[PDB]
Amino acid sequence: GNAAALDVFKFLSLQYQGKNLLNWLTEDSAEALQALSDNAEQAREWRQAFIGITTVKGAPASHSLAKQLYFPLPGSGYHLLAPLFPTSLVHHVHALLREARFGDAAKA
RNA sequence: CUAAGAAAUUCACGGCGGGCUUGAUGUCCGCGUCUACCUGAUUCACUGCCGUAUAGGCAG
Predict the structure, then answer these.
(1) Contacts for A34 with CB less than 8 Å, ≥ 6 apart
(2) What SS3 class is residue A16?
(3) CA of A75 to C1' of B53 (A)
(4) Which nucleotide is nearest to A72 (CA to C1')?
(5) Which residues have CB atoms below 7 Å from chain B, the nucleic strand?
């Protein structure tokens, strides 16, 4: 999304009590939905806004510039199989490679 | 029915200034290489004659 809009993500990435405020907003809790408000229904619509950062917006779509690749089924069929780029897996493998190449226990 | 399908890197250029690598040196003792064979498979497609012949035949 927008790079100037990442203040919401820096606000959601806080580890205030023992966990993220995101997962505190997923489950029903008394400390949740009451700290950030003085009205009830306003806190409900703020929850339904703030929990929507993990929900896909819009109809499912893969662009013409995106990749989608037929896969033959065992009987006579095909599935379209549009693959996406795993940025979390690339970030995990990239962190593993930087830790194995540049880490303190590797430099030792 | 292929991480499918698509694509102009390109223009120009002074690397050269200079130089002592030197001395010195024990390679060295010793040694069983034997054994046994078909080059011959048509392996020399030859030399010459009659004929105008390259076509064809003939002699040794």
Answers:
(1) A43
(2) coil
(3) 82
(4) B1
(5) A 64-72, 78, 83-86
Spatial distance between the Cα atoms of A96 and A89, rounded to a whole number of angstroms: 10
Nucleotide nearest to A67 (CA to C1'): B3
User: Which residues sit opposite A71 in a β-bridge?
Assistant: A79
Question: Is-contact A27 A1, C-beta < 8 A?
Answer: no
Question: In whole angstroms, what is the distance from residue A89 CA to residue A102 CA?
Answer: 19
CA–CA distances in Å: residue A30 to residues A5, A8, A48, A58, A96: 29, 23, 16, 32, 39
Contact A12, A21 (CB under 8 A): yes
How many Å does it take to go from CA A13 to C1' B25?
Answer: 79
Structure's resolution in angstroms: 3.2
Experimental method: cryo-EM
**Could you give the dihedral angle defined by the CA atoms of residues A29, A19, A23 and A16, in that order, rounded to the nearest 10 degrees?**
70
